[PDB]
From a paper:
In Pectobacterium, iron acquisition via plant ferredoxin is mediated by the Ferredoxin uptake system (Fus), a molecular machine consisting of inner and outer membrane transporters and a periplasmically localised protease. Intriguingly, the outer membrane transporter from this system, a TonB-dependent transporter (TBDT) designated FusA, imports intact ferredoxin into the periplasm of the bacteria where it is processed by the M16 family protease FusC. To confirm the common architecture of these systems, we characterised the gene cluster analogous to the Fus from [name]: the ydd/[name] operon. Furthermore, through structural and biochemical characterisation of the distantly related Fus homologues, YddB and [name] from [name], we show that these proteins share key features with FusA and FusC, suggesting a conserved function.
[name] was expressed recombinantly, purified and crystallised in order to solve its structure. [name] consists of two clam-shell like halves, each formed from two M16 protease subunits. This domain structure is analogous to its distant homologue FusC; however, FusC was crystallised in complex with its ferredoxin substrate and adopted a closed clam-shell conformation. In contrast, in the absence of substrate, [name] adopts an entirely open, highly extended conformation. This domain arrangement has not previously been observed in structures of M16 proteases. In addition to electron density for the [name] polypeptide chain, density was observed in the predicted peptidase active site of the N-terminal subunit of [name], which was attributable to a catalytic metal ion coordinated by histidines 80 and 84. In common with other proteases of this family, these residues form part of the catalytic inverzincin H-x-x-E-H motif in which the two histidine residues coordinate a zinc ion, with the glutamate additionally required for catalysis; this suggests the protein binds a putative Zn ion and serves as a metalloprotease. In order to determine if the crystal structure of [name] is consistent with its conformation in solution we utilised small angle X-ray scattering (SAXS). In solution, [name] was found to have maximum dimensions of 140 Å, in good agreement with the 130 Å observed in the crystal structure.
Residue numbers in the entry: 27 to 931
Write the structure that this text describes.
Amino acid sequence: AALPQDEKLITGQLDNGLRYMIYPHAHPKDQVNLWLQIHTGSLQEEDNELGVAHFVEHMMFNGTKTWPGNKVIETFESMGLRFGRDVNAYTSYDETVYQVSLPTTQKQNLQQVMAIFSEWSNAATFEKLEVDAERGVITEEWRAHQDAKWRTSQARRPFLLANTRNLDREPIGLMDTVATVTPAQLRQFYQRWYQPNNMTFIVVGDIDSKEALALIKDNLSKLPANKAAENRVWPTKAENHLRFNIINDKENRVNGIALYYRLPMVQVNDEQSFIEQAEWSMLVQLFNQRLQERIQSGELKTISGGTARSVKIAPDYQSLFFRVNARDDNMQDAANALMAELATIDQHGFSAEELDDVKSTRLTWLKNAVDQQAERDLRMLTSRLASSSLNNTPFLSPEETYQLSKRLWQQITVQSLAEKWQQLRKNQDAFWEQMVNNEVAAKKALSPAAILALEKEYANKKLAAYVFPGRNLSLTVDADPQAEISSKETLAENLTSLTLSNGARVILAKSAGEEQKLQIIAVSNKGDLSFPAQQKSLIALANKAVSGSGVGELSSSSLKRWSAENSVTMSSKVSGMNTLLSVSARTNNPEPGFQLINQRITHSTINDNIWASLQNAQIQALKTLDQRPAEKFAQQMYETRYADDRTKLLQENQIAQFTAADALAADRQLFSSPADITFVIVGNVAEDKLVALITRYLGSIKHSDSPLAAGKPLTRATDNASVTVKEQNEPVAQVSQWKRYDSRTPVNLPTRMALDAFNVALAKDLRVNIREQASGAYSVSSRLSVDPQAKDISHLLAFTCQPERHDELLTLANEVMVKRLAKGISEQELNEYQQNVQRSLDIQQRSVQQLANTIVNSLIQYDDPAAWTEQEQLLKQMTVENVNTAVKQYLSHPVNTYTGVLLPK
Ligand SMILES: [Cl-]
Ligand SMILES: [Cl-]
Ligand SMILES: [Zn+2]
């Protein structure tokens, strides 16, 4: 919506209307830039005042009240200030500027200079003798600087400045006006525009806010609060036809061809216009990048060089041109290279690799601009502020420029730049221009008909696409010399445990068979239950958003290319008590796998567009929840089973208040503490090369400050509830019954096997008795959940039936449960289960991904990564009485029962 002005910059206005800008800077130490900017140039001149704005500029140095004649010049010289090196002045179409650069050390010199600035504002005398002498000064300067470059721009002017006020308002004006202007006319223009409200005083340099303000208020406050004339605006009318020019000048030393486009120029004052300008800027940069790359590779031997550039032609307009410089006098070759370059872009556009190199190049410069900002060129910085003052655009800090660029450039695609290019190529306000410096080049110079015929030739050719090389991509991490392996332990036959100097744990396992795939799973003991009620629901979203973005100095697109080139894949998942970060690779190229795990942890980024989509989707989902009755009811039940603020759905405001930066900060907190991480590495790599990668990439990760305590499980509701909701407009009754059981002792691997064997048997009796029984349920479910941290087991019994049968079938499902619980398991059911699990236990050490997730599931479910290894032995140790005594101990009497019935109406 709007851009933020630099914090360092102090801007105001005095009671009399005068605007001020103060910016502190100390690259040239104890130096200050004092600029008086008049928001009036030559555009404001009347038909009988052509050159008056510039004549007035000159007359500021030729007499005032206190300093008549050349006394002002003599005064600056007494302070060691010389016109041309310390004191300057210029007039353009848009403004008149009076500039002084001087030391901050001599305080009375600063005062005298401010007193001179005061007199330039309203005390100019315009003495008749002094006026007559300047006429000559101005006339001789104009006569003397009519060189090759001046004649070239003079020749280009009618084409470039077509339909502008600027065309008819060159700052120098007419020599006839210079010779005939009366001191009264010069006085008239000066009184008209030299008024405080049309002026800005700029102060850039080694001075504090207190001192710089007192320098302004002491001298410029006294200026009478007069109102200047209103500045007029001449909007540029498009010249919607193609023009042609040939510039012949023997003094020019570069022969060539150029295509100029004329289009509006936006003022960067919001996000939309920031991007709009960046798109034009990137099309210029993309053209130059491709051209340099085609010259350096020897693909364009027929030409010298060439460039794309954009230039301001009016306050509201600009020109974007594409120039090709001819080899000696080879005009036809130059024409062919330019038209072949442009036609290629029409046909294939620019590649993602091209767009990314341009972006990464610019951001690197903007990164180095942030660091080296105190070393900025004072003149460059001062002129940049004066430009912002002129155009009424926010002055952005090097930091804010770096932030806005990375965030808003993500909105610039190969597709968005292709339409911008198509729009530009369809623009009729254009002209072809050739440059010839001899009679051989002039004869070879293309006619308008020849240019147009050449344009059609390449338009109808099926040109070959340009393959851009693309920069070498790496996620190389500098090793920590002080990173070691602290402890070693053997967990099982094929399980090794390493603890690192940073407190991280590493589980190593080799997979039998030459699959050549490596899996690294970073397991954090922090999940979404380590966050407040406003955050819980957004943690998984935040993590998906962060994992779908770039990493390190790579964009999402450069990450995709690097991933494919280095044969790697990545995924992540946010659980209630944990976060998993899965990375796959090749055993022949394992280093990239480790680099990506490290960079996802230490250098995570967030794409703003992916987060906005997840926000908007979440808001939409909340908005249209009445359209999803089952979901709505399942949510009501979730809030019924628990007495926790965290179960509640977030409102629209809560979703919007969680920003991309809040989301990036939360995701960072999960893998913030290395001591909370267990890296599961599964595959066949030479352990000596493997330990080198573990210390370099997993032992290097440092502790990051985070307030995250161990996850708090949801507070379970202390009282039972039997809810009935008549919301469905479907003739299906949906019944859910949850039974909660407390675990006196934790559920270990043998007990979970017993309880699961029982539930397989239980789910059988429910299918035969509730579903298969005539006029029964349409579906039935019997699921068993175990929460180790909460120290409880949950049993969900779900079914959908005819509404008239919901009470009868629940009664029958509960009595079937009682009967199974009393009966227990049979020898046949136990052996059925034992055979079933054994088959799955032989195919658990099959895939590198499967085995890794087995170790992971052990760590999460039993706080022991080796628990799974003792399974086959425990499976052949399971007895009828063993499971029956485990069922009687962990499923006999519930601490709570929650019932939910979703009915029609
Ligand atoms: Cl003239
Ligand atoms: Cl701008
Ligand atoms: Zn001049």
